[PDB]
Amino acid sequence: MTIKVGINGFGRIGRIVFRAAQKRSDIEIVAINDLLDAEYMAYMLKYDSTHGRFDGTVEVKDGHLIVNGKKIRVTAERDPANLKWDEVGVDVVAEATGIFLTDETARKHITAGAKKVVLTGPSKDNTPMFVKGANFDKYEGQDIVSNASCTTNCLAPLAKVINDNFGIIEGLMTTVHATTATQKTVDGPSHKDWRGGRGASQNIIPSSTGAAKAVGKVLPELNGKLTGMAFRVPTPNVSVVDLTVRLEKAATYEQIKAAVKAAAEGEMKGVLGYTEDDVVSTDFNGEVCTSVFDAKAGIALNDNFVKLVSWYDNETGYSNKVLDLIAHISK
Amino acid sequence: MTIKVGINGFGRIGRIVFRAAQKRSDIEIVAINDLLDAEYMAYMLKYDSTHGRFDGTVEVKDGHLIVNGKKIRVTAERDPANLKWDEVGVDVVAEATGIFLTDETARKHITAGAKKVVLTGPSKDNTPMFVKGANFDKYEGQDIVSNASCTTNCLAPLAKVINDNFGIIEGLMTTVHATTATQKTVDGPSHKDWRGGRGASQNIIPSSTGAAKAVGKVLPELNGKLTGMAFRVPTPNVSVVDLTVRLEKAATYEQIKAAVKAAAEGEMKGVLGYTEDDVVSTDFNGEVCTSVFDAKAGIALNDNFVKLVSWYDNETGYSNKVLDLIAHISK
Amino acid sequence: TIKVGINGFGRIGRIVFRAAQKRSDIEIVAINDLLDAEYMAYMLKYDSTHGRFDGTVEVKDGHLIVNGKKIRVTAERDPANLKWDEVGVDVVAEATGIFLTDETARKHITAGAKKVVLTGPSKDNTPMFVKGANFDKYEGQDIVSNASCTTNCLAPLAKVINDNFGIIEGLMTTVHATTATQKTVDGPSHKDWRGGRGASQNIIPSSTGAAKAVGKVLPELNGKLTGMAFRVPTPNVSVVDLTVRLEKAATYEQIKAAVKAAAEGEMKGVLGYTEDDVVSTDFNGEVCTSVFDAKAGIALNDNFVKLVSWYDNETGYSNKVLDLIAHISK
Amino acid sequence: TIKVGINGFGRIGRIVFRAAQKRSDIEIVAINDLLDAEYMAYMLKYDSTHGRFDGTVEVKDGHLIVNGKKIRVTAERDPANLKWDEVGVDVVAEATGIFLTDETARKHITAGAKKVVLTGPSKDNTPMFVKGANFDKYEGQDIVSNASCTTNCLAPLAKVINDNFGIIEGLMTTVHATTATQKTVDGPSHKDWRGGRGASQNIIPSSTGAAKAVGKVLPELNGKLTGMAFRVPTPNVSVVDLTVRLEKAATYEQIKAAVKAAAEGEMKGVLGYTEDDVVSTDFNGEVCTSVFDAKAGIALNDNFVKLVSWYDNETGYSNKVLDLIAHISK
């Protein structure tokens, strides 16, 4: 018994969610919606500059997508309320347009025949957020949920291990983040973010982010203890969090490493990773773990003040955990 | 007596035209129009990732731009017909939105009080095109003209020298072109150009262009003898034409070089350049010549089949020649 | 099965090794470079361009264990003391870029190898062979060259065009990705001043012999082609830009069909064909040494045409090195 | 006027030379590197990062004529045979990155120079001086170090923060541009495996001593700071990310005012201040070694804050090398 998913929005997250769903036997994509001709959708799925060619076959026949022998209904509806999700039997909608990030706009999917909605971004309202490895057991049957952000999915699991084992007094984070679709190729207008309109490939671009402060929502014990900011850098994919934290209980770096390794090999096997290799960003292109702890890159000034490094494929890891949230609220 | 110019569109070309106008004593910018707050316009003019900080001072006072002590009227009108160009005494409008590239849409500037219009792109209709070094003496008083494209401004002057001296039988051109504002930072929708929606910084992107065929419009003797295509590459600025030509009159490469050098030091001093240095693309960031012939990069198979290389700052060179066309149809 | 030793673990040496894991007829048994097993395992495990190694890598007693196979690791400068016969090497993939002649490569045969394939164009008259071009012209030579990555893209396309329409004369440009010889920022490069400028900032003109080398593997094209290159800020994948004059007048649609027919026929696996809106990254990992881009090309008339063909200058060339190894071992 | 010879014509050596043309108190009279005049003129003429040389460059009798001034060009490996007194060199800008100790740099004084400034952090106890930090602590030493480009950014900001609020402890990250030590594609780097990966593709963690070196130029901060770096695919301009604990509680607005006051006061020209939506390229050519980014920083509370400061790791550091030359010559 497979969970039937419709994808609203075939951007970066929507397409990588689709690609990850082909690998999972418990989740099935049955419908895609975006303002794109079916033939265009096949082209964007077939070819990916970041993640290579689609592993499988995609073709178009009679206005529908054929993906590995499976028929995908393709629609181009602007109003989510006329999506007729019930006609294809969709259980959960992966709302991935980045535009309907509130309970009232996203509820239009449930009106249109869907049973539940997962937002592939942090909610602009109080729609509950859930990060795997952090607070999945706190889901209480809500029909609209958020998977938070790609950056929160990296910070929250690492934060839990550190807090549970040593107690975080206070932490400040920087994410050295890859270029995203909202940026510009050359200096251009970006009214909502002047820095973000500067040429992405030429610049280190500071930006603000609530992802660190949002960790206090999925980890309420850390409610007012985390914040930070971002540096957008000229990479097509893969980012890394730089977490400077104060510890209540004194810990050697060797003890931090052992605590992370244990959680990575234990309760967070699929979410948190651990490495001692001389890794660089491209080594995590395709990583499913939302947080891979970089043991050698981190550094401690003393037993209570430490800087911790954790990688994440902001496309693949987040997309896989979107599916984890789909299945968690269904299974 | 200075020519008063209004700029419609403060994109890449509009801002570099503005910067080039500060260096010319015969051209004055008196008004800028775009859908941008005056403070934002000052920011985009102050800071340029490609060309550095503005050489001078820019500030905003009472909704107006103050640039080196000069007041610039700033408007944000969508309809070019309500631009009230006559209120600021604009003679010529540099139409640089890339959107009103036809006589009927651009004529709205003349209705709005302007006397003449220069399109900073190739016309979508038959609005006459003029390239400096090619056909400025063919201007016959038209009130709406086009400066063609940045690529045509590189190919046309070099084509004239080669044709005048040796006779071009036929030529095929490739422009290895820098990233432009129409491209995307990561794989994304570009309905009018699927290749152009792929991540600009990751890819060599083939594209079509009429710039070579357009040379037959500014150089009618070459009407059906030139065409070609483009490769978009991950550079923020500066492009280069790769011209493979057949010659009627046999010429050694030394004779081609001498003919180009003579025209560069003679009738085309400001338009066509010549170098024998080991130049790379960044060496022409800020180049005013629309075509700098790369002597060492070119290669000949024989005396009638030769490949010629010419650089151009697709932002600075074209912007300077836009001003040359403004002044030519006024002076 | 052919037992292969790789001399030189650079870009070509490492991608050849990765490609060899997919073929059941070729197995790598020894690697030689001045690098030591622990570093080699790291470079093989992690690749910025082609992702993580598909399989398992570990180090044991100064040797590599790769997918359960023990690889001898040596660091010998003189190929004559490489003791290839002690590890049973049949063919040597000479990939240092340094021993590109019959006399230096003969030291591999001296050290116990049977045949040698140079992963570059020969500096002497060592015969060159390109798949799809002249593999049938092999006459049992024990030292051969696989030419260059650019030649492996131009030669198959050139053959189809010449065989079908007759090339009078052609000029080629390869828009080429950044390579290891370039610098990250403006720096000294005595042998090529342009090449020392910052690779990531620049379109850099550079020289190439690949077009005239096509006249060696396709003697009918001797002295009919030349050209040059532009190195551009991409990590991998290049494309040839071939402007040619044709004897027999042909519409561009007729050119397309002739290439497609050869891609689906006599050159399957060597030459590819597409009408899709492809970009460079779509060929990262391409096995075909030449994929014809139908939509990118353009014709001025029926006798003057510009033809575009992609190639992964790492993967495609590396696979054909193995293709030549197996061909000279039959 | 101070007559300067530059040993080493790399990135720092060439940008120091360009910066010296703007100052009337310092003139370059000799350059030494294994490069020859014709190449040096080319590298000086054309720069991918900073544009064409502002002025005229030509070669005459193996020597450089730059803006009408004759520059002696030598290619001496041993600094003791550099004959600095024959060209009247007062101070030597030691910029090879190779002679970073009192005993190797003393060979310059042996060869006729009066004083030496190393354009890097000393490997021995050669005193380090950062403008805005401890220039007033110079006691006439003939060999000094200007520390690193990153130290020149952290030390002035650290001083303002410590002087005003008291730093208990700080951890710093510098998001740093690509440098000449990196590779264009995955390649051998024995001394730093991460550093051999393709610079243009990767965020690359790397080490840095710049934070602890701040404890040397600001002894009050001894053992209170450490950190590391991420090398990113930009050709130039870097930024320090300083997370600090403060003794005296301060709102972020109070921190901003304290930095702005110092930037407009005692550290004018060294420390800068902005509230604009700046990005890295806005500081390509910046003379200030540290420009505080008010909007980029963020505070968790009045005692735990993250501070952002930009630096052109080429231009800013190069200007302060000349600033140290002139300070030790007074």
Automatic annotation (TrEMBL), chains A, B:
Site, as annotated: Activates thiol group during catalysis: 177
GO molecular function: glyceraldehyde-3-phosphate dehydrogenase (NAD+) (phosphorylating) activity; NAD binding; NADP binding
Gene: gapA_2
Segment forming the signal sequence: none
Organism the protein comes from: Salmonella enterica I
Taxonomic lineage from the root: Bacteria, Pseudomonadati, Pseudomonadota, Gammaproteobacteria, Enterobacterales
Glyceraldehyde 3-phosphate dehydrogenase NAD(P) binding domain sequence ranges: 3-150
InterPro entries in the record: GlycerAld/Erythrose_P_DH, GlycerAld_3-P_DH_AS, GlycerAld_3-P_DH_cat, GlycerAld_3-P_DH_NAD(P)-bd, Glyceraldehyde-3-P_DH_1, NAD(P)-bd_dom_sf
Domain of life: Bacteria
Stated name of the protein: Glyceraldehyde-3-phosphate dehydrogenase
UniProtKB/TrEMBL annotation, chains C, D:
Organism in which the protein naturally occurs: Salmonella enterica I
Family: Belongs to the glyceraldehyde-3-phosphate dehydrogenase family.
Protein name: Glyceraldehyde-3-phosphate dehydrogenase
Sites annotated Activates thiol group during catalysis: 176
Gene that encodes the chain: gapA_2
Residues given in the record as D-glyceraldehyde 3-phosphate binding sites: 148-150, 179, 208-209, 231
Gene Ontology MF term list: glyceraldehyde-3-phosphate dehydrogenase (NAD+) (phosphorylating) activity; NAD binding; NADP binding
Glyceraldehyde 3-phosphate dehydrogenase NAD(P) binding domain: residues covered: 2-149
Role: Catalyzes the oxidative phosphorylation of glyceraldehyde 3-phosphate (G3P) to 1,3-bisphosphoglycerate (BPG) using the cofactor NAD. The first reaction step involves the formation of a hemiacetal intermediate between G3P and a cysteine residue, and this hemiacetal intermediate is then oxidized to a thioester, with concomitant reduction of NAD to NADH. The reduced NADH is then exchanged with the second NAD, and the thioester is attacked by a nucleophilic inorganic phosphate to produce BPG.
Catalyzed chemical reaction(s): D-glyceraldehyde 3-phosphate + phosphate + NAD(+) = (2R)-3-phospho-glyceroyl phosphate + NADH + H(+)
InterPro entries with a match to the protein in the record: GlycerAld/Erythrose_P_DH, GlycerAld_3-P_DH_AS, GlycerAld_3-P_DH_cat, GlycerAld_3-P_DH_NAD(P)-bd, Glyceraldehyde-3-P_DH_1, NAD(P)-bd_dom_sf
Enzyme Commission number: 1.2.1.-
Pfam families: Gp_dh_C, Gp_dh_N
